[PDB]
């Protein structure tokens, strides 16, 4: 399939450089998978989402999206026009208050969530979860986060917007999650952008346009962009039977394009997130 005048940033994924405009990728598109996007929430309601978004826990008031955020990341995995994985399921788990803030132990409850609350859902194909959130390390941010990810998920987490090494945040530092990177359209490390060893990939991040609350349509820029570019692909992936939850985030770094990316700090994967479709 081909997407024209897609967003820079799906038709970065699907090329061997930048600069392009159409987003090519198979018409399964992620069907039969399921994407968790652990943020503000999702507006379901969005004509995006064309019925394939649900909010499946709050640990707030309201499982609203009153931010947008959520939405914005939800939107980067699977909305229709703004989406990698267009024929995606979307489950969202509001950790995130309103002001985009949340207590370490609500963040950690959710993460736990997830890991029952795939058995009580039909993912077939596979199933991810998108964390475009962090902090301070903490061993028990980590700790969930592994946890996640040795139950059966392809966990995505952004390495942070700190302009430094990663190693210091939760969790982006967590060895055995997919910690992802933000690059922008001319193949720059984003300024913002984490980097160290941590980090197992980078995905589009600068001047990402998605959906936004009130049913419209934004362009915003961040690790947590990026991070969504990633965790849709897996979806992708595993609905091709390409990778599992426990190999995607080797074999997108695996499959990346390599050394393309300029100014990555030395000791840092200079890899960029592609889908290696042919049309
Ligand atoms: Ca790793």
Redesign the pocket.
């Known amino acids: 399939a081909a997407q024209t005048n897609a967003p820079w940033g799906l038709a970065r994924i699907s090329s061997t450089s930048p600069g392009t405009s159409t987003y090519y990728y198979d018409e399964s598109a992620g069907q039969g998978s399921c994407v968790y996007v652990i943020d503000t929430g999702i507006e379901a309601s969005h004509p995006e989402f064309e019925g394939r978004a649900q909010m499946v826990k709050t640990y707030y008031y309201s499982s609203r999206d009153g931010n947008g955020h959520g939405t914005h990341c939800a939107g980067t995995v699977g909305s229709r026009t703004y989406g990698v994985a267009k024929k995606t399921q979307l489950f969202g788990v509001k950790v995130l208050d309103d002001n985009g803030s949340g207590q370490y132990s609500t963040i950690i409850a959710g993460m736990d969530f997830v890991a029952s609350d795939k058995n009580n859902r039909n993912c077939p194909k596979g199933v991810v979860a998108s964390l475009s959130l962090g902090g301070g390390y903490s061993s028990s941010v980590n700790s969930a986060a592994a946890r996640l990810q040795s139950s059966g998920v392809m966990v995505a987490v952004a390495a942070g917007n700190n302009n430094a090494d990663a190693r210091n945040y939760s969790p982006a530092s967590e060895?055995?999650v997919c910690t992802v990177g933000a690059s922008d359209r001319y193949d720059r490390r984003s300024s913002f952008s984490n980097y160290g060893s941590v980090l197992?990939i980078f995905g589009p991040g600068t001047s990402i346009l998605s959906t936004w609350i009130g049913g419209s349509t934004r362009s915003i820029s961040g690790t947590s962009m990026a991070t969504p570019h990633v965790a849709g692909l897996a979806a992708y992936l595993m609905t091709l039977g390409k990778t599992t939850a426990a190999s995607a985030?080797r074999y997108i770094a695996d499959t990346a394009n390599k050394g393309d990316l300029s100014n990555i700090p030395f000791g840092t994967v200079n890899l960029l997130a592609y889908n290696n479709y042919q049309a």
């Open positions: 060895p055995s197992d985030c």
